[PDB]
Every structure is written in C-alpha cells, then in structure tokens.
Design a binder for this molecule. Structure first.
Ligand code: NA
Ligand code: NA
Ligand code: NA
Lengths: 369, 369, 77
C-alpha cells in the first residue's frame, strides 16, 4: 500500500465526527494482541493451547552444546548431577546427538511444520561460565502476545539464553517481547497447556509462586481467551529430576495433552487436589508406564502436533502403545542422547506458532465416562 | 577469560559443600537487575532518578518526520489538531528543524553526554498509516531493568514505534526488554522522576489506572530501591494539551525536577492531593510563567543533566530566570520547530543511562523551609 | 486440628501438610504414601527420617526454615 494512499478510515478507531474523548477511549479499549502485537509483527504467533502446531525451532548440537564438556562440569560432575538428578547413561555422543536431531527435524518436515535453526557462537559463555542446557529451546517458546525472558531456578548455564532466543525471535521473525520474569523462578517454556486456556505449572526448583504470578498475569492478558486457569502440580523433587520416583520439576515431564480431554500423565505427578481438578473438568488420564517414567525415558514428554497426533520417544514402547490404544497417532523419534541432560524431545523444541484449538468447554462437553 | 578456565567459584551462588536445595534457593533469591539483566547486557542502563545523565539518543528529521506531510493529516488537519490541542504556529520547516537538532546534539557533547542517532526507513508506516510523532524519542527512554513497549492513548502514528526503539536498544546497546504494556494506556517515557524512587504519572488520555499499574509493578521490581512511589497528577485536559489552561496529558509538560527537592511546575498541574503529597515530602515548587505554559512554549519541559543543571527552551525567558533564581544553571537551546507537534526538547530525547542520584530521603532531609 | 490444638498443652500449634502423589494408600511406582507415618518421622530433636517421595517444595522450605535436619531413607527400601 502506497505511503500517500493512507486515509483516516485505515485507523480502526476512527469514525467521521468522532470526538477526541471517544477516539481516545476506543484506543484505550483496543485489544493489544490483535491491534498492536500481531499487526506490527506482520503475523500471528504463540504456542498456547492444543491446536495445530505449524512452526518450531531446533538447535543442531556442536561440541559446545554438550553439558559434560563444560569446564565447570569437569571440575565437579556431582554438583551438576545433583542439580539435574537424571540417571547417568554415560557421556553424550556428539555424532549420535546430531543424528537424532536430523531425525526430529524430518518428523516435523514430513508433517508440514516449518523448522528454523538456531546457532550459538563458538565457545558460548554467559557471565558465570559456559552455556549449559542451551539445546533445550522449549525454554524460548513464544506465547500469544510475545516472547518471555525466564528466571532459571537451577541452571546458571541458561542465564543469557532466554534473552538470546527472544532476541533471535524478534530479529528473525519480527515477534516482540511480552515480559521479563524478574522475581523468584519461572521457566514458562517447560510448562504446557491442556486446553486453549489451561496452563499446567509446578511449584518446584523451576517455579515459585511470585514468578508464577508474574508470568500468569502477563500471558492471561494476551491469551485470546475470556478466562485463564492455572493447574499447579506439587512434585516431590529437590532438583530437576527425582531418580527414585520419576517426579520432575517441569510439567513437560509430568503431563501432556494427547487429544481433546485426554492426557498422558506420570505416576509421580498428581497430588489429590490436582487429581480432583482434572476429574471435575472431565480429563481422561492415560497413565505412563512407571519404569519408563522412573528411568527418565521421558514417556510424558510428547509433543502434540494436533489433537490425536504426537511425537514421542521411540523407546517408550509401553507408554506409546497406551497412547495408540487411546486412538492417538504416535510418531516415534529417537531421543537417547538428549535425555543425558535435563529434558527430552519436546523440551528441545521452541514452539513458535500453534493455531487456536479446543477449549476447556470442549473438554468438559466431551462424553466419554 | 578462556572458555576452559571457568570454575564453580565463578557462579556467585555456588559455595563448597552447598546442597542442591540451598543453591536453588540462593538462585531464586538473586536480584534480576544485578545478577541477570546488567551482566548479560554487559553494562548498566536506565534513566531512573535525578542523578547524572550520561547517554541519550536523538532522531535527525527527514521529510517523513513531519506530521504535516502525512496523507492522513492532509485529509483532516482538524482531526489531529483536536487530538493534540496545541496552538497552531504554522508549518514545520525541515531545514530549521535539522539545525535545532544539531544545536541540541552540540549542547549534549559540550556537557559530556554521549549521543546516539536513530534513523527510520523511507516512507515509514505502521499498519494504520504513516508514522507520526516518531521524532519524540523520550517515548523510548530505558528503565532500570530494560525497555518498555508502550500503549499510546491518542496517537495511532506511534503504533510500532516503541517496538522499533526497544529493538534498536537491544541490537545496538544490548539492553533487554522489561515489559510490554498490554491494557489501557501507558506512555512511560513521557513520565518523569523527581527522586531516585519517585515517579510522576498522570491520569489522562495517555494513562489509565490499569496501564499505570502494569508499568509501575514492572519497573518497581528492577528500580534498585527499597520503596517506590507514584505521584499521580489529574490534569483537566481532553486530548494532549488544553490551550485554555496549559494543562497537558503528559507529566513532562506539567512538572520536572531542577535540583534536589526543587521542581518547576505548571499552574495547571497540581490538584490538592498532589500538592499535599509534595508539601509533606518537602518539595520546593518554582511556578512556571502562566503565559509561557498556556502558549505551549513548554517551560516545564526541561531536561535535567544533573541536580542543578538543566537544558531549557531558549524562549522561555521568564521561567528560565525563575530557575536561575533558584540556583540552577540553565543551558538555553532553540526549540521552535519541535513544538509544532505534541512535545518540546525534553520530549525528543531518549534517555539511556543516568547514574544513581539523590533519593526521596535526601529530598526529605534538605532543610530549606 | 481445631480439636487437638485446644488440648495440646502448648501455646501454638503447627500443621505441616504433605501433598503426596498417590491415588490410594500406596504408590508402588514411587514410594509415595497417603499416610505421614510412611513418609516421615522424627528420630531425634530436629532430625527426621524422610522418604524421597514425601517433600514437595513448600514442605521442604518449611522444614529448612525451621531448622529440621533430614536423613533420606534408602529409595529402594
Ligand atoms: Na495441585
Ligand atoms: Na527532571
Ligand atoms: Na506442603
């Protein structure tokens, strides 16, 4: 459209004969997401909900991506093994890690999902040491309304990284920032949603109440939904993972939607209040295999491509058969090397755009019991 | 520092023998501004307070910087004159506008202040028309903790512009975003501070309570101060300016600090509650000349370089003499072309860095009455 | 708690409430239990034996702030 072709009618709040007060008031009442954020970006964005995923980002590992090669890790493996708490399966193999990355990218491409690639500098470091955990791009997933700078609860190696990803999103995709978390802890990208307006968080090493309150207040305003619900799990774990039980600080390892009103869920996830809430709101629970969970094969860490279709770890044979039995298509992808650190396949995916999908009302209205 | 020289002692929360729980808790308790925002940026930043200004940005006008060249302005001058409410002083002259810009830059250089330059594209437009008001870079001033995306209450021509300035600050200076305002109206860069922890806002066309609450909550957490105060003026004005009275929607036209516990203030600014608050907190008021105020010569729009030294419009002879009588040095700078739109000299300056300066306690402790 | 607090013989009364992830009495996948007596117990003044499956973050914080020392039970046992 030509620079000299613009007219007052191109301003949505403008009307012939409108008073100053009325124009201003209409401006104050406009919706931020649809009036400002999306039009200025030139596109929709946000991974909220359980609708159709269209766009993601991955990181192709280099030798600097490997947590066990940080000089700080070398100084004290046991310090980082306490923070992470995941089973020791030996050193990360770079070549195999690269191969499973290619396989994940192909799964997306075979299903019509756009894949962007995020690179980091050589010898990447923040003020406190080498980057660590920066393969886990879910930590930079984009909300309706914009990107978030996180406060990491347990991993100093991620300082600077949510900044880098948000900046990448702005420069590469024109997606703006929504908020920085500035108190307590909050790692929103490791949260997930089980309906269009239902967020699952934890209280854990990765989330306190103050951080949660700040994040939820910001994303609720741009959620595109009338109401917003936060189901808060209360896992018994000290760091990231509890290898005695399968309990995890991140929702993405405890629970995930596989279809409308159907969740895959860890044995270690549901305290009584959470169970009651899910029951009352008509969610059907597919229980993950207990050994798969406890051994950190990440059977709940499935990525929903759309209701009824997920990407899952190829070696979660028992959980994946239960998911298929629930009428859901499973795309199996190798995820052996990724699980040597604090996450699985879903955890490594930055979700950029998901189309609007089924609501909590749709969950409540499904007749299945 | 070498990539392989990092040790655990480089992590501030680390200590020999610390448990996982204790390390995580120390991480949750760390201060965002000094642990994350500033170290990742590689520098301090923020214009908060009344200390020494060190760094600003200006825009050198082009033909597209002129509001009277927008096709929307041409379609209805009276619409925009209703929104703005400022006296008509005739057409902007590009070349003279450029000249007064160079004069302001020289004043900054003569006073030891670093000046960055912001350019816009040719034929710059947002989703709703040509940019308008984009010379006024105060709207992009940087807070302790980071940049802000604003919700403009009356000027659709600024949609997209606070985004552009924040992105510029991130790419050019490595300064991160703090928050996007997503409800109501809030134009924080046209606010000003009268002590290290005292923010002056208005309730007006440019600010509602919801927008104010969002902004104040965000900047208070990174203010670097134990307490934070918001003095809210209640000007009687419909749009930007009330040409019958001198009242303005923006604090920056109503009031400004000139020294520790000394303010220049418009006759039209102080409702009884605001006057009482200023009295109880020991602020001395220098009243701007009423004719200079009403004629929009912007006599309260002075830029504090440090306590006791301001830049002011060269033609505010009466107010400037009152400021000098109060023991403050005035640097007079031409600001004729800038005032044809909704702002004065201070309004066109993006403040990037101001050193920590006197506190509300310092104001309260000054003995002068 | 209202009933026993009035006859406790003590000026104050505190209830630490654990939130175990278990559907019935016992969770054989995790070691979590519906009963406190299987999750935690005092062994001396300010020293507790405690299950890996017992302590949510709020409970852990409360115990830490009140100076209780935790001996972790063997996870397989
Ligand atoms: Na719960
Ligand atoms: Na000032
Ligand atoms: Na508890």
């Amino acid at each position: 459209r030509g620079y000299d072709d613009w007219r007052l009618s191109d301003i949505p709040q403008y009307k012939d004969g409108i008073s100053t007060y009325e124009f201003v008031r209409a401006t104050h009442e406009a919706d931020y997401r649809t009036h400002q954020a999306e039009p200025v970006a030139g596109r929709t964005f946000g991974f909220n909900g359980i609708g159709r995923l269209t766009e993601v980002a991955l990181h192709m590992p280099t030798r600097y991506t490997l947590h066990d090669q940080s000089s700080q890790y070398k100084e004290s493996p046991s310090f980082f093994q306490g923070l992470m708490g995941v089973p020791d399966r030996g050193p990360v193999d770079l070549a195999a890690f690269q191969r499973e990355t290619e396989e994940l990218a192909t799964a997306f491409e075979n299903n019509g999902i756009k894949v962007h690639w995020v690179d980091y500098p050589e010898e990447p470091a923040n003020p406190y040491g080498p980057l660590m955990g920066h393969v886990f791009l879910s930590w930079g997933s984009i909300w309706r309304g914009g990107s978030v700078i996180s406060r990491f609860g347990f991993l100093p190696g991620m300082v600077g990284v949510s900044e880098y990803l948000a900046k990448w999103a702005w420069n590469t995709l024109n997606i703006p920032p929504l908020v920085a978390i500035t108190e307590g802890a909050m790692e929103p990208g490791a949260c997930n949603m089980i309906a269009d307006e239902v967020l699952v968080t934890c209280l854990s090493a990765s989330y306190d109440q103050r951080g949660t309150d700040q994040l939820v207040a910001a994303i609720s305003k741009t959620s595109g939904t009338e109401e917003f619900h936060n189901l808060q799990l209360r896992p018994a774990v000290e760091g990231f993972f509890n290898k005695a039980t399968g309990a995890c600080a991140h929702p993405d390892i405890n629970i995930n939607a596989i279809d409308v009103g159907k969740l895959v869920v860890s044995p270690a996830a549901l305290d009584w209040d959470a169970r009651t809430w899910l029951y009352d709101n008509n969610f059907e629970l597919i229980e993950a295999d207990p050994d798969e969970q406890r051994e950190f094969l990440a059977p709940c860490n499935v990525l929903l491509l759309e209701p009824g279709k997920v990407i899952a770890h190829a070696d979660c044979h028992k959980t994946n058969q239960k998911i298929r039995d629930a009428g859901v298509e499973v795309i199996e992808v190798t995820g052996t090397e990724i699980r040597k650190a604090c996450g699985g396949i879903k955890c490594r995916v930055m979700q950029i755009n998901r189309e609007p999908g089924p609501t909590l009302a749709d969950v409540r209205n499904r007749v299945w019991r």
